Design a binder for this molecule. Structure first.
Ligand SMILES: *[C@@H]1O[C@H](CO)[C@@H](O[C@@H]2O[C@H](CO)[C@@H](O)[C@H](O)[C@H]2NC(C)=O)[C@H](O)[C@H]1NC(C)=O
Ligand SMILES: COc1cc(/C=C/C(=O)O)ccc1O
Ligand SMILES: [Mg+2]
Length: 242
């Protein structure tokens, strides 16, 4: 179902500021090349990593921008202290405030709201899946871990996890913990997920879960690096199935 912003004159793309409980915070809004204000769009949050900023995720959005056509609106929010510590839920509240604002300004399909990010931004995507499973259709942490909290975390939500076997910063076992939570929440049948050897190609494992709540795990043989050529393709294909 489409939001109240449908049919309204659109704002401009660029850096926006927003008051969150007295705290001034900032995000980048990127409209598609051809924005039809009468068509419901996907909404994709891309979340930066530690010591990064919103300006590192924009303009490429982990490879999604080049694949998305006119179907998606992109948002790159800025973390406090170049991170997503999410103290007391303040970063979940930030996302709540962005959503309230953009849904009233833009034509968004409420069943196509997504979040993805790398490392600390993958932790933050996980926190949104824990606390806002009613809002987000799917999350895709890249080298994620439980480092931004997880309040709630019992509801199902479609999940794609990507992680490198030789990641020395957030070891892959931390990403498997995130995955295993949604294998339980989504009612997935137990299944072995093989992971590649050194110098071997990525291995994607698709689980059998409740119909609306798929779980996919992709392990690649590299390290702490989101710039693999399959990343944008796999995330887009996962998001566009809904
Ligand atoms: C908003 O998004 C939903 C889900 O993507 C759309 O519902 C889909 O409609 C297409 C039409 O063939 C089919 O793939 C399915 O029937 C629906 N997919 C689901 C429910 O996952 C919906 O049409 C979009 N637009 C509006 C106005 O709701
Ligand atoms: C190991 O624990 C942590 C790791 C990170 C790394 C974030 C990043 O690389 O983006 C952040 C916070 C942590 O508590
Ligand atoms: Mg298109």
């Amino acid at each position: 179902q489409n939001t109240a912003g449908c049919g309204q004159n659109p704002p401009s793309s660029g850096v926006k500021s927003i008051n969150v409980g007295g705290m001034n915070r900032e995000y980048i809004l990127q409209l598609p090349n051809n924005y039809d204000p009468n068509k419901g769009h996907m909404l994709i949050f891309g979340l930066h990593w530690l010591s990064g900023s919103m300006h590192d995720v924009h303009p490429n959005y982990y490879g999604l921008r080049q694949l998305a056509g006119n179907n998606a609106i992109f948002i790159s929010p800025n973390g406090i202290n170049n991170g997503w510590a999410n103290d007391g839920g303040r970063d979940v509240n930030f996302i709540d405030a962005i959503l309230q604002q953009v849904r009233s300004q833009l034509c968004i399909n409420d069943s196509q709201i997504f979040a993805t990010g790398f490392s600390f931004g993958g932790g933050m995507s996980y926190a949104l899946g824990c606390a806002r499973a009613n809002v987000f259709r799917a999350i895709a942490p890249i080298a994620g871990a439980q480092i931004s909290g997880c309040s709630g975390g019992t509801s199902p939500i479609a999940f794609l996890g990507i992680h490198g076997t030789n990641d020395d910063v957030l070891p892959i076992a931390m990403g498997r913990q995130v995955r295993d939570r949604f294998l339980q929440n989504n009612g997935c049948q137990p299944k072995n997920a093989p992971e590649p050897g050194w110098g071997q190609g990525p291995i994607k494992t698709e689980y059998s879960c409740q119909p609306n709540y798929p779980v996919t795990w992709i392990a690649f043989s590299g390290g702490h690096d989101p710039n693999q050529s399959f990343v944008g393709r796999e995330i887009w294909d996962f998001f566009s199935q809904f």
